């Protein structure tokens, strides 16, 4: 999913 994990 886009944006989930670099948060």
């Amino acid at each position, epitope marked *: *999913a*886009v*944006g*989930i*994990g*670099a*948060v």
Partner: antibody, heavy 118, light 113 residues
Framework: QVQLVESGPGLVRPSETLSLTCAVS?????????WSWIRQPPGKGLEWIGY????????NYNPSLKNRVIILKDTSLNQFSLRLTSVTAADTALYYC??????????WGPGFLVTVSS | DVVMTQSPLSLSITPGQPASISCRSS???????????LSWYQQKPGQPPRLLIY???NWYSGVPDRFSGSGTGTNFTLKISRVEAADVGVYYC?????????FGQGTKVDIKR
């Protein structure tokens, strides 16, 4: 209506650099999406290579690639491209360009077969 | 990496019967936003995978209800309730919450006839 197409060479010499370009139509590259490259050696599993963001956040790549991967995006041409340096026979595979979106990988390209041979 | 393990690696389905693939992760796929980011893809030969399920039980647009996903935490299960002939191919589970992104090795589905 979103379609992605990979283009480039089908043959690259070893130790050289593999360049692949994914052209996106049906949506602007400057959206809330991670434009990603994933490879699959024929008849085997999927290896996630990495992504470049449609926003301003930095790209992230797979540590298994040993700092050989650069993923770039070009808004003016509405495309994104993969550069993979110092290729070996292990890098011979099918390369898919995809869009990781608000759901998950929404759309995949048909796949492009790159063979590393002299 | 978050290691994804599928079981079984080769699954022959019997007509008129249901079929079940399991996918287990080395870490929880629960994100801080409360959602679970697990996805199921189907890959027929010579073409890219198709997105079937994201968010273990939500169906992607155009995917039939006969494909179903269940599970919590590290245990996930994809069931094909009543198969079609077209449904042969390789099925993958993938987590979209942890970096690097990871997929299962894939379960090859062939039909009995």
């Amino acid at each position: 209506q979103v379609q992605l197409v990979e283009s480039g060479p089908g043959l690259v010499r070893p130790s050289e650099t593999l360049s692949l370009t994914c052209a996106v139509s049906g949506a602007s590259i400057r959206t809330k999406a991670w434009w990603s490259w994933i490879r699959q050696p024929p008849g085997k599993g999927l290896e996630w290579i990495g992504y470049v963001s449609g926003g301003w956040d930095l790209p992230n790549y797979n540590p298994s690639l040993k700092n050989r991967v650069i993923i770039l995006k070009d808004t003016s041409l509405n495309q994104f491209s993969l550069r993979l340096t110092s290729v070996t026979a292990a890098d011979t595979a099918l390369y898919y360009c995809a869009r990781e979106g608000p759901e998950d990988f929404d759309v995949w390209g048909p796949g492009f077969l790159v063979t590393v041979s002299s | 990496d978050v290691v994804m393990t599928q079981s079984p690696l080769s699954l022959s389905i019997t007509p008129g019967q249901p079929a079940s693939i399991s996918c287990r992760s080395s870490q929880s796929l629960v994100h801080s936003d409360g959602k679970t980011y697990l996805s199921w893809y189907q890959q027929k030969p010579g073409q890219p995978p198709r997105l079937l399920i994201y968010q273990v039980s939500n169906w992607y647009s155009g995917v039939p209800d006969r494909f179903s996903g269940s599970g919590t935490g590290t245990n996930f299960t994809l069931k094909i309730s009543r198969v079609e002939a077209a449904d042969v191919g390789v099925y993958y589970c993938g987590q979209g919450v942890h970096l690097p992104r990871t997929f299962g090795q894939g379960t090859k589905v062939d039909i009995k006839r």
